[PDB]
Amino acid sequence: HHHMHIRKERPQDAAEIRQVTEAAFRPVAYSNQKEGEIVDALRAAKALTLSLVAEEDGQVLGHIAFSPVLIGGAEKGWYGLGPVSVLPARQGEGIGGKLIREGLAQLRGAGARGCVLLGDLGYYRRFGFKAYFQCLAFGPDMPQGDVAYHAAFD
């Protein structure tokens, strides 16, 4: 019962998810510390498409959010990945990678057409993202058009 496992969030997790998110982003120099707010706003708007936690000994160690993105104003089965957050002390152990791979697998399994993200130049290549935006297509390549994240992201 000391094993880490990944599962979908439940309503009872909201405070802890936000605590982990805010801890992860607190020292991030370009962060305006809105990532916790964003997750909660996505949830409030029913736009938190997928929300997974990594849990061990009843504690949330990490979290990932996915939400729909519009392309040229249209819903085309594309999602944005983020935020993803792991407790600072438990980073560099593969938790983030496990959350990302599992989240992508669940999106694909539910009929998604692709995922986009903004982030580190090289890290996300291990999940198939290719290069602003990085993109992972589950079928045809990403259709052209302005990418808009949900209003929660501002």
Shortest spacing between CB 74 and ligand ACO, in angstroms: 22
115 neighbors 86 (Cβ within 8 angstroms):
no
| Residue 21 or 71 with smaller CB distance to ligand ACO | 21
Interface residues with ligand ACO (CB under 6 A) are 24-25, 28, 81-86, 91-97, 117-119, 123
Q: How far is the CB of 144 from ligand ACO (least distance, A)?
A: 22
Nearer to ligand ACO, 25 or 138 (CB): 25
Task: Tell the smallest beta-carbon distance from residue 39 to ligand ACO (Å).
Answer: 11
Distance CA 36, CA 60 (A): 14
Least Å distance, CB 12 to ligand ACO, is 22
Q: What type of residue is 109?
A: G
Closest CA to 68 of 111, 128, 30, 123: 111
Report the nearest approach of ligand ACO to the CB of residue 108 (Å). Answer: 17
Is the CB of 71 or the CB of 103 nearer to ligand ACO? Answer: 103
Which lies closer to ligand ACO via its Cβ, residue 15 or residue 28?
28
Rg of the chain taking only CA atoms, in angstroms: 15
Q: Is 9 helix (H, G, I), strand (E, B) or coil?
A: coil
Nearer Cβ to ligand ACO (25/153): 25
How many beta carbons lie within 10 A of that of residue 53, not counting itself? Answer: 21
Neighbours of 67 (CB within 10 A): 23
**Position with the least CB separation from ligand ACO:** 96
What SS3 class is residue 131? coil
Which residues have a Cβ under 8 Å from the Cβ of 124 and sit 6 or more positions away? Answer: 100, 117, 134
